[PDB]
Design a protein around this ligand. Structure first.
Ligand SMILES: O=C(O)[C@H]1O[C@@H](Oc2cc3oc(-c4ccccc4)cc(=O)c3c(O)c2O)[C@H](O)[C@@H](O)[C@@H]1O
Length: 259
């Protein structure tokens, strides 16, 4: 009953990846709140649970398929299905736990992780930092096999964690930022994998702050600048929503929009 977007990594191109991410955004929004030309995700409060999630079915060159569940309120992966098993990140508010019981209700085996989905938990689990984990079509292809074979006991947990990190960044963060989508399109266009540079990681770390600064801004103007980093790690200050318009595609809801 939840909407499904399909994507295959095998023979993926800039175009098929672009179409996939646009379709993902399309399902996450309307939610027709746009603040400064930037769509805001639905406020979870008052959100009917039938509208809470979307499903992203990934398949790969090995003909393996896993379906991820994304929370439409933050674009984030809450868990996934592989065959007859479903796995969920440990929630952290009883409304979440409530919400996820409506996911993958037909599956035989449903497990909840001890851990949550945040990069901090995941990075230690993987024994690697985001900056040391390659992204690209290759890593995503492998991530899909890893996620699938976990449902059968053939995947070590640190490989799993690494797989979540790859997926979350190439789907959730890409839906959130045209800039990160751009970074992944480029890796795909040249079939090169590489770890995310500091510009990517700082965007990811600052998504909440960015959303708040934009929705609280005075006519687009930030009362206080936000520091981001360039590709080479040198820092720069954002003072205004204008420069973020071609960077950020979705925002998490923060308060009502002022009339
Ligand atoms: O940006 C901040 O200053 C602080 O914001 C906090 O996060 C939120 C802030 C928020 O601030 C506002 C807000 C702020 C000023 C005026 C009107 C509204 C509304 C929110 O819905 C909101 C929210 O949902 C947050 O999660 C964080 O919990 C907190 O860590 C952070 O310090």
């Amino acid at each position: 009953q939840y909407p499904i977007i399909n994507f295959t990594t095998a023979g993926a191109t800039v175009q098929s990846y672009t179409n996939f991410i646009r379709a993902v955004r399309g399902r996450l929004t309307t939610g027709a709140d746009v603040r400064h030309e930037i769509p805001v995700l639905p406020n979870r409060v008052g959100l009917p649970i039938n509208q809470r999630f979307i499903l992203v079915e990934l398949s790969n060159h090995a003909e393996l398929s896993v379906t991820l569940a994304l929370d439409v309120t933050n674009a984030y992966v809450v868990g996934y299905r592989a065959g007859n098993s479903a796995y969920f990140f440990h929630p952290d508010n009883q409304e979440d736990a409530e919400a996820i019981t409506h996911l993958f209700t037909d599956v035989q085996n449903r497990y909840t992780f001890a851990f949550g989905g945040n990069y901090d938990r995941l990075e230690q689990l993987a024994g690697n930092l985001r900056e040391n984990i390659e992204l690209g079509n290759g890593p995503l292809e492998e991530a899909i096999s890893a996620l699938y074979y976990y449902s059968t006991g053939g995947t070590q947990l640190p490989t799993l964690a690494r797989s979540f990190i790859i997926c979350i960044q190439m789907i959730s963060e890409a839906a959130r930022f045209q800039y990160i989508e751009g970074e992944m399109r480029t890796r795909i266009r040249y079939n090169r994998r590489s770890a995310p540079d500091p510009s990517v990681i700082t965007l990811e770390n600052s998504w909440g702050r960015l959303s708040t600064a934009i929705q609280e801004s005075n006519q687009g103007a930030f009362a206080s600048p936000i520091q981001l980093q360039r590709r080479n790690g040198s820092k720069f200050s954002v003072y205004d929503v204008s420069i973020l318009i071609p960077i950020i595609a979705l925002m998490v809801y923060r308060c009502a929009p002022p009339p």
